[PDB]
Scaffold this active site. Structure first.
Site, short mmCIF file in Angstrom:
data_model
loop_
_atom_site.label_atom_id
_atom_site.label_comp_id
_atom_site.label_asym_id
_atom_site.label_seq_id
_atom_site.Cartn_x
_atom_site.Cartn_y
_atom_site.Cartn_z
N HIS A 41 -30.10 -26.05 -6.97
CA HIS A 41 -28.79 -25.88 -6.35
C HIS A 41 -27.79 -26.93 -6.74
O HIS A 41 -26.64 -26.86 -6.42
CB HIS A 41 -28.94 -25.78 -4.79
CG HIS A 41 -29.40 -27.04 -4.14
ND1 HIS A 41 -30.74 -27.30 -3.91
CD2 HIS A 41 -28.70 -28.05 -3.59
CE1 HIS A 41 -30.82 -28.44 -3.22
NE2 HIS A 41 -29.61 -28.93 -3.05
N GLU A 72 -36.84 -23.42 -7.27
CA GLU A 72 -35.81 -24.41 -6.90
C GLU A 72 -35.75 -25.67 -7.84
O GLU A 72 -35.27 -26.74 -7.44
CB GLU A 72 -35.91 -24.84 -5.37
CG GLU A 72 -34.61 -25.49 -4.91
CD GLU A 72 -33.28 -24.75 -5.13
OE1 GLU A 72 -33.30 -23.52 -5.25
OE2 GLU A 72 -32.20 -25.40 -5.19
N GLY A 146 -27.47 -35.08 0.77
CA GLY A 146 -27.42 -36.23 -0.13
C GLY A 146 -28.75 -36.69 -0.63
O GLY A 146 -28.77 -37.50 -1.56
N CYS A 148 -31.20 -34.65 -1.82
CA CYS A 148 -31.81 -33.74 -2.75
C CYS A 148 -32.05 -34.31 -4.16
O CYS A 148 -31.25 -35.13 -4.66
CB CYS A 148 -31.22 -32.37 -2.82
SG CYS A 148 -31.45 -31.43 -1.31
#
Ligand SMILES: *[C@@H](O)[C@H](C[C@@H]1CCNC1=O)NC(=O)[C@H](Cc1ccccc1)NC(=O)/C=C/c1ccc(N(C)C)cc1
Length: 181
Positions: A41, A72, A146, A148
């Site tokens: 993402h 992901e 923040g 990730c």
């Protein structure tokens, strides 16, 4: 200084980089050669800010499983000057749980940050912000925006990359050494 802190600080110096994309600030784990991994993402584009300079992205691969479902993780090949230290040996060959893991984050906003997420357990399916993801693991810690791309680490093993949380729990994409062959 003891071995666990030495290991994490060495990751922070040599492999775990502060980055920014159009989607905000993330931690990026450089795995070997010019290959790094980010949360999908983060949506890396043709260039990515890495610490102090803009770096061109030569390829980006969004990982899915045999059912076609999101993992992901996006693998990017970079036009960096130097190769990363190869840390593939620290990535287990299967997706693996851990006791008393630490999430190591490194962004401009959260530099050299250590979060005590604790035990990391198999979770599997996760629906985050509308997108199904497979192969996740979970920790009972209230992770936040923040964080990730943070690296979930325990006893010299790099097991996961932080991707999401629901206010009480955190979730990583599991890492296995074959994603980086
Ligand atoms: C890192 O970018 C970030 C960390 C999250 C933010 C809140 N705590 C954390 O640990 N991750 C996200 O924001 C992700 C992004 C994502 C998009 C698509 C697939 C996989 C990940 N999304 C979330 O963590 C979801 C947050 C969320 C949405 C909606 C609710 N309500 C209560 C239904 C709760 C939490």
């Amino acid at each position: 200084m003891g071995p666990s802190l030495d290991f994490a600080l060495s990751l922070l110096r040599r492999n775990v980089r502060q980055v920014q994309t159009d989607q905000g600030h993330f931690t990026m784990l450089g795995v070997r050669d010019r290959l790094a991994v980010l949360p999908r993402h983060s949506q890396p584009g043709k260039t990515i800010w890495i610490e102090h300079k803009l770096v061109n992205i030569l390829d980006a691969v969004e990982l899915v499983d045999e059912q076609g479902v999101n993992l992901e993780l996006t693998l990017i090949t970079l036009d960096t000057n130097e190769k990363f230290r190869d840390i593939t040996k620290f990535i287990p060959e299967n997706i693996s749980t851990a006791s008393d893991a630490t999430l190591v984050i490194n962004t401009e906003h959260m530099p050299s940050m250590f979060v005590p997420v604790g035990d990391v357990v198999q979770y599997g399916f996760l629906n985050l912000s509308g997108k199904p993801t497979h192969r996740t693991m979970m920790y009972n810690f209230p992770t936040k925006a923040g964080q990730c791309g943070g690296v979930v680490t325990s006893v010299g093993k790099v097991i996961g990359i932080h991707i999401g949380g629901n206010g009480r729990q955190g979730f990583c994409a599991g890492l296995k050494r074959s994603y980086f062959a």
